[PDB]
């Protein structure tokens, strides 16, 4: 509904060769990207989207664009290779989305955590403060190999949306054969 630019951040770690979701996690995250980006597209054609990989070299596959076809096309040969480097991935996401043409568009980060993530406890909590001062709304989805919202990630997201902000969600997927339906139940349309 809101006028926004969204950076989807899909995992391409070797851990993506897990298989808890429907037949292949590798294919499954593509349908997840499809359903999340379609929501941002149908809300308003001016709302725009880019994409990023968080694992290995955090390369910007797509710059912010209203052409969703570029995002769905670039999801090919995403080639799960490395491991989630979230520490730099989340910040490069915002650094990339802030180069947006239409500055009135809202901040929005959606990222796929499909691998175990290691980070400094003392600082990950204040990266939330960083993105707060940068006014960035961040929704993070966690996968089965994440042991259901590690305390660090829960604290980080809670302080990022603390004091009853937008309530940007940290959605853990129900482990096993389940898609990103937990987002489209309500959080993607409310939060």
């Amino acid at each position: 509904m809101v006028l926004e630019s969204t950076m989807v951040c899909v995992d391409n770690s070797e851990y993506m060769r897990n298989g808890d979701f429907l037949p292949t996690r590798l294919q499954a995250q593509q349908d997840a990207v499809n359903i999340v980006c379609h929501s941002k597209t149908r809300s308003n054609p001016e709302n725009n989207v880019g994409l990023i990989t968080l694992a290995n070299d955090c390369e910007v596959l797509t710059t912010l664009t209203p052409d969703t076809g570029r995002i769905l096309s670039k999801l090919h040969t995403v080639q799960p290779k490395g491991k989630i480097t979230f520490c730099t991935g989340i910040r490069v996401a915002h650094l990339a989305l802030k180069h947006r043409q239409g500055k009135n568009h809202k901040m929005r980060i959606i990222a796929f955590v499909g691998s175990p993530v290691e980070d400094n406890e003392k600082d990950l909590v204040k990266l939330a403060k960083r993105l707060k001062k940068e006014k960035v709304n961040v929704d993070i989805i966690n996968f089965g190999e994440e042991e259901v919202n590690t305390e660090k990630l829960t604290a980080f997201v809670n302080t990022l949306n603390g004091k009853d902000g937008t309530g940007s969600h940290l959605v853990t997927v129900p482990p096993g054969p389940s898609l990103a339906d937990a987002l489209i139940s309500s959080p993607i349309l409310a939060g």
Binding site: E14, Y15, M16, R17, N18, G19, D20, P23, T24, R25, T77, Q79, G144, E145, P175, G176, P177
Partner: protein
């Protein structure tokens, strides 16, 4: 098919930690966690007897595997091929993987290096050029991972078993040592590599001693305790002092392949003396 994770529950130290560990990963379809541990156990100090189960397990895992990393098969198959020890069935053992391993991951090179090693065992020269020259050109494209290069250069260093490979053996052994240098295996193997590299340098027709390996940590920190004569004559070469007594010392230290080549060795030392003396 699912009954195999219980039939295989025996034949391992600590049945839970070795079979139920991967059973929990297999049951709830979480795949990459399984692939982590399947490779983990093949290095166990046992006779890798679980491979006997793997003879059927490969069928039960790969009917609808749909996730498996190609490295996370070839790395275990190159150990099962060593464990089985039958050169005839090794060729068909590698093939049923190599036929399906053609993905974007460059893993068929591991299979090629493995069959090269097996063929070098059974006939060091017959067609062993082909089983290495089919990798040399494809060693290009993606030279960044360098573990494939480690395996290939180890194989082509074992190619020193071919009679004439001495100087090229020195070059390729140095290249392999540059592929990986941290310990990763007993100091006995490292000192053996250093010793053979020293003989290769002292024996190669076009290589004499060369430097910066005398300062390479992988040999100097290892032979100050034993077999010092090799480093002593290497220092003599890198100093040019044409010397008899320590040359005889390294001669009795390793008689064949070093002592019967005195005429060659002398030609090196004197040559090097000129190099040192105009230096």
């Amino acid at each position: 098919v699912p009954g195999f994770l219980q039939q295989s529950q025996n034949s391992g130290p600590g049945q839970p930690a070795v079979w139920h560990r991967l059973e929990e990963l297999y049951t709830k379809k979480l795949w990459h966690q399984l692939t982590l541990q399947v490779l983990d156990f093949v290095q166990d100090p046992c006779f890798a007897q679980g491979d006997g189960l793997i003879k059927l397990y490969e069928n039960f895992i790969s009917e609808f595997e749909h996730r498996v990393n190609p490295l996370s098969l070839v790395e275990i198959i190159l150990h099962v091929v060593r464990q089985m020890t039958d050169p005839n069935v090794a060729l068909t053992f590698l093939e049923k993987t190599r036929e399906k391993v053609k993905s974007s991951d460059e893993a068929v090179i591991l299979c090629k290096t493995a069959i090269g090693a097996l063929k070098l065992n059974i006939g060091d020269l017959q067609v062993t050029k082909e089983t290495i020259e089919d990798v040399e050109e494809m060693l290009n494209n993606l030279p960044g991972v360098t573990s494939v290069h480690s395996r290939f250069y180890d194989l082509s260093s074992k190619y020193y078993q071919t009679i004439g490979n001495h100087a090229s053996y020195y070059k390729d052994a140095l290249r392999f040592l540059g592929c990986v240098d941290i310990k990763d295996l007993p100091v006995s193997e490292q000192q053996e590599r250093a010793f053979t590299l020293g003989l290769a340098g002292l024996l190669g027709e076009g290589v004499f001693n060369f430097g910066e390996l005398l300062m390479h940590p992988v040999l100097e920190s290892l032979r100050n305790t034993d077999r010092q004569w090799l480093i002593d004559t290497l220092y003599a070469f890198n100093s040019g002092n044409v010397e008899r007594f320590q040359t005889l010392k390294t001669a009795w230290g390793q008689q064949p392949d070093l002592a019967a080549n005195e005429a060659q060795l002398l030609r090196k030392i004197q040559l090097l003396c000129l190099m040192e003396m105009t230096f």
